[PDB]
């Protein structure tokens, strides 16, 4: 097996052709497509852009909320000059459950809507001809998948997603689909670990190939070689290394090659930032110095396109995060497109990487009969995420769950499995966390013991004791924080969520909940609490921007806790954060 | 700005809007209004259902230790409201409670005192009613038997089975109506409340709850049910205009179920209601 | 070797997209060329392509930058392409472009809305990476399309001063594609349709840069239905399935150069068979009258400016179908080819418009730079018709938007361009232009050249709005009585009418800027349209709110959209849906 999660690159040995554009599309309400031969051509179809969720193109709700099997189809050319090479199709992701057919032959299956996979087609494609690519997708939710939920059936027989999570169940092909030509012997993986030294830095590496020819690794500052090594394991000695820092990124160029004499059998290239990250004495140390995390929980969410990758929106989001003085964000509730991490690497932003283990909430959750099948799917996602993302300088922590019912029996065995795995799989041994739900308190949470740092999602002053009660909210908040003080045992804490829904058009004096003035007051109270406790070492606000949810009486066209609108313009709270975050030192509270 | 203060400019605008939209009736939802509002109803020819502030009556409510003292305050309010308003041509019925827990033990004793009193005090013996909460069903309400006509407050498609569930909301609404048909004993029914919160600035296609398109679709679904049942003889929508509530996660600067904004300007739904209500004859369904 | 054909992959051709994150730098001092920036930017930021650069930034100075700026990327040329011609296609580059590869300047282009190629066969290194550097300039002048001025602020910074009502978005707005092509290749082809008793016949021409034999084959699906040899010929299609409004049918055309048993080059494309002509004051599509209904659009969306985004295109078409439109005009510049491909597939009619907007104030067409403007106008008309002529959806050419056609010099300028459009278009489709409010039946020197008249009128908005709307209708009806006397049996459509409308505003009774006023305005205008037999189409301004330069009249851009910029309906969208889906396709087609 030649599994590889490496980003597709063009090199002397590798080719890449994007298959994005307008595809053919059809719902399959009776699940008849396979036996009816739809993999060889849809009888009826519409056009559908890839990448994008399908939901928000339509003007009818039945299509927006379709839940079941659906098909994507396109034709791709395979140049004849590729005939010596391995041929594969990379899917950045496909949501949620995928079956891939090429020329009518089923060539791949995949579980989980937010991580990449390849379909090898070397012996199925016709060369110098067009070939049919058919993708049978399904977007139904069940209780043993990431993310977790249910599928209901309406009184008219129609299926509808019923998530256990607070975001719309967007599905489709959300990320670029890329046809690749690869040499039969090739680099499948590599890893880097960094060490600071008196003369500079040292990068310890491994490379994994599917063959035995010789491996070299060269490191370049621009076009100037600064270090090289031979062998699948080694050390790169970088004199006076230029370290990657917050808002001061520096990226070297790594070149990995397989050699057969004077012939280069395979070349893989990628940017690499050199930096250390670790928890010591209740602080996050980046290159040996403390950093106070500030930023957001985000979503892959925008108007029209659902979760589809859009480099324009990504660019605007980073411009806004720099303007506001953020330095960190969490990939709230699923791994993002690789491109978002690539830009974080360039811009000097810190990332907490999170698998889609959200909705594990109300017998308690971790005693359900399906817990073993869920754990399997969870290990798979955790493995692929760490494998895909481990070499990004920007990625500094792993978040293993969001708001699980960690008061349930069965929590310890479940968490121990996954937290050990995260330790095993990450060569850099980055810290591990999970977002603690409101119902899980210092005194009853069976899961908090496993985290290297505690991440709280708290809504004191919104879901509890909002409005005129915010005085009581603050007192109840401090009460819980005194509880955490007794179980932390020197570990740091961050907030991964806090926020208040806010209509971007709403002004009131005095404030009311849903007004911009209330949002500012809400945030000031929370920051007063944060600043009161030595062990609070970061604040990520919920959310960067307004985003879509299922309809309900609580959701005024989606979630309105954004600091920015869905159109990436600031609410009043954006200027409050800008004043706070740009005025706190990078090492705020670093001596506490 | 003025809260509940009387302001004849606003009253005048409210009547201009009710005439424009084709309304003929309103209920004094949750408390008796200032006299001037009934005087204008008399001048313009509107029907009024007069309601005392017996709202919030959530051990069941009517087994509480303070029930005797509540009843005494309720008797006084009913007496002064009928005493003050009985001579208005516009006032044509008495609403004695809004959404009491009329499944509670002790409901019958409390209701009988008050409904008997309303009969004794009114020289014109106008019909008596109360707004029935959603949890009070044909098969478990101990209070509906007292009403001369039934007034339902229903939110099928808002609080219950909203959004993509509206198809289920309509089915459950019809089933419950089928159950009311068996207890009405020939009495008429009106809806005193139905509605959906709507930001006056929100448009979406397809609709989402809180959009003006959802408000229109919600109203259409409900009207289709109303029109299916011969015994439905009136429809009062909640609410005429956005109004202030206590702060809360459910209230985007107060209640937004208004057909008009708090500034007395129409949302899309006002044009839906204008087209419907001005097209129905005054005696719509009068032979059914 | 000029060719405006859409880049395709075939047995002889390769295409690799260069879209993604590029490097970018402003060049405020215009120093980059002499400073060797083409071999690498000293300082740079990342920038998505395709997109406008403007709306990413948080500072106004960057959003409003006017001058030289650079885009750069590295691109791989596979060694297996040796022997092929290597070219980089730019869908567009706004406004004035100089292209460098490995430090060598290989192309220049004028005009920000039409494609061009940079041939780099002998400049690139094979099986290696090469540096692509793009020096762009977005300054406006009075002799370009579109027209404007570039002002200098008191701090010395330049700022665009358009003579047109849309923001001066610039950047690389459309896909950049690297191509490998055979040295002898198809450069162009044209089709021309005729209906017959037995089906349809397609008269074609093909242009190549060589002498080897040419064949043309037409396939229904995979099923060949016609073929022919020669650079000119006819394809006989029995029982031809015609392309129709909201009912498209597309055949596949395959053009090949042959050298014995070898296919030297192959080009493929979809083609819809249909006729379109003006007869007795009506638009005839496949011989039957069509009443045009729809919009003026823009290439405009949140964040990306005029950047191509298939997601927004798909939504726009879903909304146009939902509302009952059948037609739009490419308001004030040719759009990305992808929009026309979708119109071919969905059965939408398009009026293709060149960026000849801003020609207004000695009168405009007596300005000293008039001959320079005309030359740029001819090139854009040449490239637009050459690019778009084989689209079944394209059924008319708009040669200008609101020129001062009352000016001296109008006749000689217009004749040149209306004659040229016939020389450029084998199908001889109807030609028009959008007539400004100040140009009336009795004083317009331009209107006589149009095959159908297109009016932009704002009776009830810019003229006699509000309580004056009763006078606006009377003045409108008088002007229409005047047009009746000069039409000479020609049809008329409205290409613009509309009223700015905040999507949040309700008032009873209406005020200008409220949704109720927008509805009343449209009702008044439609009452007038329906009073005149010669009105054969209505295109409202605009499909969606779009960005303009800042100003007291522009509440964050133009608010005349029927949809918001986020593609949600205002009240008037429901008004149009009820009207446009109630009108028969051949509405007013017998009068
Ligand atoms: O919601 C958000 O914005 C985001 O927050 C996170 N999660 C936080 C907790 N969570 C809730 N979501 N919705 N409602 C409530 C909670 S908890 C809670 N507790 C409540 N009471 C506690 C006991 O005393 C009285 C108050 C009440 C309510 C809620 C709402 C109904 C009435 C009272 C799920 C989402 C998610 O990580 C994030 O993906 C999501 O977007
Ligand atoms: O609310 C209005 O606009 C107006 O309506 C009337 N009253 C209607 C019912 N009433 C409610 N107020 N707020 N929330 C709920 C109800 S009932 C209900 N049922 C619910 N579930 C029941 C079981 O099945 C599924 C649905 C849920 C909720 C509510 C809210 C949280 C989510 C689930 C009190 C006010 C008042 O006469 C009026 O003065 C007031 O202004
Ligand atoms: O504007 C739009 O929305 C769109 O319309 C088209 N164009 C139409 C006319 N045009 C104008 N733009 N702005 N203002 C005026 C005009 S004409 C006119 N005439 C006026 N008076 C003439 C003499 O009698 C009394 C009325 C007055 C005004 C205007 C403005 C101030 C009040 C008096 C240029 C743009 C463009 O093709 C389109 O790209 C643009 O987006």
Author numbering:
A (entry chain D): 2 to 363, 379 to 608
B (entry chain C): 305 to 362, 379 to 608
C (entry chain B): 3 to 363, 379 to 608
Q: What does the study report here?
A:
Because intestinal β-glucuronidase (GUS) enzymes have been shown to convert a wide range of glucuronidated metabolites to their corresponding aglycones, we hypothesize that gut microbial GUS orthologs would catalyze the conversion of TSC-G to TCS. Previous studies have shown that microbial GUS enzymes can be categorized into seven distinct clades based on active site architecture and/or cofactor binding. Our central finding is that specific gut microbial enzymes, notably, gut microbial GUS proteins of the Loop 1 and FMN-binding clades, mediate the colonic reactivation of TCS from its inactive glucuronide metabolite, and in doing so they drive the gut toxicity of TCS.
GUSi has been shown to intercept the GUS catalytic cycle and produce the covalent GUSi-glucuronic acid adduct observed here and described previously. Using the Schrödinger molecular modeling suite, we docked TCS-G into the active site of Fp2-L1 GUS and found that Y479 and three methionines (M454, 455, and 362) are positioned to potentially contact TCS-G. Mutation of Y479 or M362 to alanine significantly reduced TCS-G processing, while mutation of M454 or M455 to alanine significantly increased TCS-G processing, perhaps by reducing steric occlusion during TCS-G turnover. We confirmed by circular dichroism that the mutant proteins did not exhibit significant structural changes compared to the wild-type enzyme, indicating that the mutations are directly responsible for the observed loss of activity with TCS-G. Furthermore, methionines 362 and 455 are unique to Fp2-L1 GUS compared to another Loop 1 GUS enzyme, E. coli GUS, that we show poorly utilizes TCS-G as a substrate (see the alignment of Fp2-L1 GUS and E. coli GUS in Supplementary Fig. S8).
